[PDB]
Symmetry: D2
Subunit: 210 residues, 4 copies
């Protein structure tokens, strides 16, 4: 069904995600696991990046190596919970430019509310990685993509922890070219827009807010 | 090379190329080694077995997955394997850790153990053995020897760069050991360094001569 | 003249801060150094925290040890640049609750307004650490303290990298009980509200935005 | 009345140390705490380092800053347990040279056995930081100091987690110029050379060895 979805299949991700799902897992551990899983999802999510051959001189001899255009990578957390994922991916892409997009989803209305967007310069060359752990209805990530495109972004990859089918479908309907990398695809949403079985409220579980 | 996996990822190639570069100092070199090890870890741990287990999420009960976490063993070869171990332990924080010190003689091409301190090993244990430079292979073959002497069965070798001779030597002796690397280089020079390689890994990590 | 100000005097902080100040220092290194300085400033900023005696059994024998009320610590970055400080402090206080505050400061009117604030439960018992690297006019941190107090915060400690006299003075005028820990006190503000000699625009230098 | 001993008094160190002492604390957490305590002990152990004034140009203006001779710092773990400490201090001193000294203490004879020493160049200018968590009889650290001095080291600082009085005294008797920074001074040694109340076997508890 889901042309643009990659569900990353790795035993360590399964392991770690299951601990996150567990309601007894507190915020220190929940954050650690989120960072760690993002590091593994990063493997798959960045596999597409382009290399240029470049000469290198080693201590022994000259040879031909490889280079990515490093400043051309843009990492964009959706606040708050995407912050922790951004920390993870920046361990792998430490010379990326970073944007921040503040959106929350209104609990009652289930619409996205934008409160901040500060982005580095964007153009056709820029590879953007947008990060938000829970892709539920999709309204938040769609809004963030809207803001990215508006500001010149072309190539955008979404990295999430868990998606629901309707969220993935929503993103595909609007933005057919956006690839989505996740640790799991769950079953559906409950009446309050939470992913089932999911893991509850990610922001609250990360930061101990109520 | 039946047992060799050369991990092909653009981020690994990028980072490895900076490590190769003679101008890259110790602080960066270490960072890059740890970062590459995190990526090589993906591929090197793909084989680990899951058990299904019940979990209750805040929403509902469901079926999740679990690895026997204490049954993983991480074993750096001193010194330069230390930085790799730091990397992999980010991903496998509940592993037991062993340490092995081997001196390789350049003149005779023989290896001897100077230290080995291991956690309990048995058939169930998944051992990851870490050394950046797999050159002649004698060091990793000695470390595998020690591991097997102490009860290890399943051993996976993770390295940064290998030379063909080192890979062959390991496969001749220990045909079941899988080897994950960032690169397979061309050959060794008259002093047993990998070409083009990256020089002396330990010295470049810690700024020793 | 500055009752509530602690300028932390340590050769490593001076060293690292000098590197941040240097205009050639790129975003990767600037972030690193900010986190590392925050770790050292943490030493002094948390020295006041109260211990309870508790029994502990070690593998050899029982003894009396010490404990802090860990979940009663609250870390609050001011977005964006406080985010990197928060990562630093959370390495030492990983069981803290985390709040996030977004304040716009208007350059033309000198007024500050909240655009986001998401806080964990606050009360008299909670030890709050509020983090923002550049304490210039002071209006941003004063608005954040206002919001904290509004939501029940009592004990609040400000941690910054560099402050200007006017900022310190402004905080002391409003909130006489807030202690302020910094790596340096600089000379003054320029016509555009930047600290001299300071280090430029901290957010932009951390994230490579313009 | 131990002239060269500094017991670092900080409520976060006491908090963290108490968790390490607790026999139920597993290897993952034990390692994190040892690295975190070392960061705090680093504050006090490096306070003495010497600054040179240097010019820096910030994006705003030229000013006078500070600089330490960074490559002139040497970090030396005693294997194995010292490794985790070195990892912590290297977070603050990332440009330091690193030596390794392999010594274990024979459980039966309580004598130090050296199996490895690989050191960067040493001279009178070099500031050496020697790290080993448990300073019990002193034999290990005395042997390591011996090796350092033999190779040209002059200024040496010992950082440990817990010391026993007899170990501190033994170091003072031999090397009266070596300062020792620790998180705690415990009471005495038992019959097998373990610190009471201490925390058991540091190497085993870090790495899950028997
Ligand atoms: O099970 C869920 C579903 C949604 N959200 C939150 O709601 C937003 C995503 O929902 P949506 O905009 O994709 O519907 C994010 O802020 C996310 O953290 C959760 O925490 N858990
Ligand atoms: O190009 C090389 C070749 C070997 N070694 C070092 O030699 C050992 C591997 O030797 P071998 O036993 O595989 O020949 C390791 O400890 C490694 O750091 C290097 O640093 N660079
Ligand atoms: O020299 C300066 C002065 C201010 N700011 C920014 O302005 C805010 C502090 O402003 P103020 O409200 O203290 O004036 C912070 O968000 C900070 O990043 C700087 O980056 N550099
Ligand atoms: O309570 C103790 C006492 C000693 N040691 C170990 O013994 C050595 C220090 O003892 P000594 O040489 O100071 O006597 C170190 O390897 C240290 O890890 C412990 O682990 N726990």
């Amino acid at each position: 069904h889901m042309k643009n979805l990659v569900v990353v299949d790795h035993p360590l991700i399964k392991h770690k995600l299951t601990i996150m799902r567990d309601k007894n897992t507190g915020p220190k551990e929940f954050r650690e696991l989120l960072r760690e899983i993002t590091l593994l999802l990063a493997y798959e999510a960045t596999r597409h990046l382009k290399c240029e051959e470049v000469e290198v001189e080693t201590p022994i001899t000259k040879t031909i190596g490889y280079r990515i255009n490093d400043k051309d990578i843009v990492v964009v957390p959706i606040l708050r919970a995407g912050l922790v994922m951004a920390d993870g991916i920046l361990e792998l892409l430490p010379n990326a430019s970073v944007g921040h997009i503040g959106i929350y989803r209104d609990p009652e209305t289930l619409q996205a509310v934008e409160y901040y967007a500060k982005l580095p310069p964007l153009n056709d060359d820029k590879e953007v990685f947008l990060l938000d752990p829970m892709l539920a209805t999709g309204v938040s990530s769609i809004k963030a993509i809207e803001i990215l495109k508006e500001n010149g972004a072309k190539k955008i990859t979404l990295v999430a922890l868990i998606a629901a089918p309707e969220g993935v479908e929503a993103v595909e309907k609007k933005y057919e070219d956006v690839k989505i990398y996740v640790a799991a695809l769950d079953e559906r949403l409950n009446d309050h827009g939470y992913i089932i079985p999911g893991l509850g409220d990610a922001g609250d579980r990360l930061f101990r807010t109520k």
